[PDB]
Amino acid sequence: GFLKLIEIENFKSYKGRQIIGPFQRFTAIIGPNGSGKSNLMDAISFVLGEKTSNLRVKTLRDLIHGAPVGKPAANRAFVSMVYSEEGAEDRTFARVIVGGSSEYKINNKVVQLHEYSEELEKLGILIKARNFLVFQGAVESIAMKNPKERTALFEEISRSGELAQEYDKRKKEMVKAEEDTFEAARKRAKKAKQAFEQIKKERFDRFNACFESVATNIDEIYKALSRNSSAQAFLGPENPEEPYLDGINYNCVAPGKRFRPMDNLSGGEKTVAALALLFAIHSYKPAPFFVLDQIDAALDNTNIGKVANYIKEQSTCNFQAIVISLKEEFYTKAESLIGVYPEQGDCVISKVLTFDLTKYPDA
Amino acid sequence: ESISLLELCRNTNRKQAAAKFYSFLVLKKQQAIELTQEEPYSDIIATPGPRFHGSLEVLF
């Protein structure tokens, strides 16, 4: 489905009741330096269940407009997300600050957080994993992971890492039973390795289901980001039989260079290689919408247009893109702009404007 | 008086239209103008703001 609109009431600088959107398949949130854009990112995180400690406050009550300086506009605030899906009624997900704590609602029915999370998960929105979010600095974080840190990441996203301790403990038992081996000792060792092969097979299958998807997609992504047919990208386990035990190697052929580990790249070339891995990882478990918070801050004028055009292309079919963007060479590829501006008041007030770019021709 | 964003963007390309839209946000921040938009994706009308007293024609 689709994130159609966000409705806000008295949340941080968004005083009063405001409609944000409707969103198009590719929408950029832009505006001059101010609390407004990051507050809107926080509203999205908040309606998707983010914890208080991750919303730049110490108390939930301080998310109410004016509460940080002792002048709250109200004793309630809310953020609501309207989720649309072709062939179905709209679904509304809301989080309300009532009496200082969260009230969760689905279609105005009060629910507990467990059910809210479950109903979002059925849509492909994983609020604990935050699969919908590319946080500021995510590109540089991926760029810096060594082969073993890549394997760690694959174990997390594939949930194969949830079987690690059982794997280690079943392997320890198998080693002991094998060390012992009259016939009953043979019988205990056989069952020991069988129970170990079970968890080994299961950890492999969970890892492989994720890794092979990411590994299959990364080449085309790297070609698309590079806008070059000759670029090539390769993921490969150092230990093919048990990939979770060793590193995941990542070699690229940059559009003019030779086959080399991504490590041996630098500058915008390494950034585009890290972007390809980031987007390939998100092509497993992909949320219906993708919120990219200032991803273009990591780009320079040699690849900003390439990444913007990649998101433009992907947004027509594979996912909805919502990008908070500071750079015109990125956000002018969007279908519509949500422009955030400040209003004077006792506290900073943010309001928005909507603008359709599809009405105008390109360069 | 008043200035229509959609009229200013008539005959512009995407980058030009986006920059005029963005200029409305900056000029509102600087209090040179006030902004109204009746409904999502409608025209956006600028009027004189408290911190600029010339003509709106010259501001664009």
Side-chain angles (χ1 to χ4, degrees):
Chain A
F2 190 76
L3 200 172
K4 174 198 278 181
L5 76 72
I6 288 162
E7 188 176 8
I8 296 177
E9 184 180 273
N10 287 313
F11 179 93
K12 300 194 96 163
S13 53
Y14 290 91
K15 193 185 196 304
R17 185 169 300 203
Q18 306 191 32
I19 297 289
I20 309 305
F23 294 82
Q24 305 305 308
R25 278 184 183 266
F26 184 2
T27 297
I29 292 161
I30 69 176
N33 293 340
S35 321
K37 295 193 309 290
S38 71
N39 283 352
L40 179 49
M41 179 67 245
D42 287 347
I44 292 165
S45 299
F46 170 87
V47 76
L48 296 176
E50 185 60 78
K51 290 178 174 177
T52 311
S53 55
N54 291 331
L55 295 172
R56 304 184 292 158
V57 297
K58 309 296 285 188
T59 73
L60 206 75
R61 168 85 62 174
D62 287 329
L63 298 168
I64 298 176
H65 179 81
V69 295
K71 293 162 146 55
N75 61 4
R76 273 177 145 75
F78 72 79
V79 182
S80 183
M81 167 182 71
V82 179
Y83 180 87
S84 62
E85 170 187 321
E86 186 164 329
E89 308 195 340
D90 286 349
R91 264 157 303 202
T92 296
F93 292 81
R95 186 178 177 182
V96 191
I97 310 178
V98 177
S101 72
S102 298
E103 181 175 294
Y104 291 93
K105 295 174 157 168
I106 302 173
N107 291 338
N108 246 19
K109 159 193 173 193
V110 174
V111 302
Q112 299 309 301
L113 173 59
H114 175 280
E115 176 174 3
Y116 195 85
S117 181
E118 175 178 359
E119 289 304 313
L120 288 167
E121 177 170 18
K122 294 177 182 176
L123 309 179
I125 304 161
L126 309 182
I127 64 172
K128 305 159 210 162
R130 299 182 196 100
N131 67 331
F132 56 85
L133 177 65
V134 181
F135 45 101
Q136 200 182 4
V139 175
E140 314 176 308
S141 171
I142 276 294
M144 295 305 125
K145 291 180 181 296
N146 66 28
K148 260 157 193 166
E149 290 158 352
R150 294 191 198 109
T151 300
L153 181 55
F154 277 102
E155 284 232 281
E156 191 185 18
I157 285 161
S158 73
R159 294 152 285 103
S160 72
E162 293 172 8
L163 305 191
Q165 292 188 358
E166 178 74 16
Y167 171 98
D168 295 326
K169 283 163 181 176
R170 293 201 192 182
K171 199 176 198 176
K172 179 162 68 172
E173 305 302 316
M174 176 196 65
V175 176
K176 290 170 188 171
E178 286 170 352
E179 283 176 346
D180 299 344
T181 305
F182 34 93
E183 161 211 334
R186 194 193 93 248
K187 278 192 166 64
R188 288 192 309 274
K190 176 222 187 184
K191 303 181 176 185
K193 100 188 300 285
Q194 284 185 157
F196 162 72
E197 287 181 286
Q198 270 298 94
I199 191 68
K200 170 181 174 172
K201 181 180 182 63
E202 190 183 346
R203 187 184 186 181
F204 176 92
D205 291 341
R206 294 155 77 119
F207 190 98
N208 211 49
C210 169
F211 174 80
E212 292 299 331
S213 296
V214 176
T216 293
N217 296 332
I218 192 163
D219 181 73
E220 285 162 356
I221 289 171
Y222 185 57
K223 284 168 159 58
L225 287 174
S226 282
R227 290 196 151 265
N228 190 309
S229 309
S230 78
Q232 294 187 97
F234 304 99
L235 294 175
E238 182 66 26
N239 184 345
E241 294 66 29
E242 293 197 81
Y244 40 80
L245 297 181
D246 206 324
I248 298 309
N249 305 316
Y250 180 23
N251 284 35
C252 296
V253 186
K257 327 296 190 54
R258 71 182 176 276
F259 187 77
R260 272 145 30 187
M262 179 253 248
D263 167 48
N264 303 350
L265 291 175
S266 283
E269 246 173 31
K270 186 178 185 173
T271 296
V272 168
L275 267 169
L277 176 54
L278 180 63
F279 285 133
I281 283 177
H282 279 279
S283 70
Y284 179 82
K285 276 175 151 63
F289 55 85
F290 213 7
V291 181
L292 313 190
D293 186 6
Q294 289 173 300
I295 193 167
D296 47 343
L299 314 184
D300 55 37
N301 300 80
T302 67
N303 54 34
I304 175 130
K306 283 168 189 166
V307 178
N309 277 325
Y310 174 74
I311 294 297
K312 182 177 198 121
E313 282 161 16
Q314 293 295 309
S315 77
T316 59
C317 50
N318 289 343
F319 56 81
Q320 175 187 12
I322 298 163
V323 310
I324 301 165
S325 176
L326 300 183
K327 300 190 174 171
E328 60 155 16
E329 271 112 17
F330 198 84
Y331 62 72
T332 55
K333 276 71 180 176
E335 289 172 85
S336 68
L337 307 179
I338 294 173
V340 186
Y341 64 88
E343 188 97 78
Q344 269 315 304
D346 286 340
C347 302
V348 166
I349 295 159
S350 298
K351 289 178 183 173
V352 304
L353 302 171
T354 36
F355 193 69
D356 182 3
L357 288 181
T358 65
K359 297 180 166 187
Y360 312 98
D362 301 348
Chain B
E1 76 284 31
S2 58
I3 296 297
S4 148
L5 181 60
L6 289 183
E7 272 300 324
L8 285 176
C9 297
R10 214 158 214 275
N11 305 125
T12 64
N13 62 48
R14 262 171 179 253
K15 175 184 171 190
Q16 284 175 321
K20 294 200 172 137
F21 174 70
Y22 187 86
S23 81
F24 273 39
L25 309 167
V26 172
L27 286 169
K28 169 62 182 185
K29 172 182 180 186
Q30 292 171 186
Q31 295 187 267
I33 66 178
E34 149 73 329
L35 296 172
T36 76
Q37 184 176 32
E38 175 76 5
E39 69 182 47
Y41 297 100
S42 75
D43 204 355
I44 294 162
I45 309 302
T47 54
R51 206 168 284 178
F52 182 80
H53 293 325
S55 167
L56 288 181
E57 263 197 352
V58 324
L59 215 53
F60 309 96

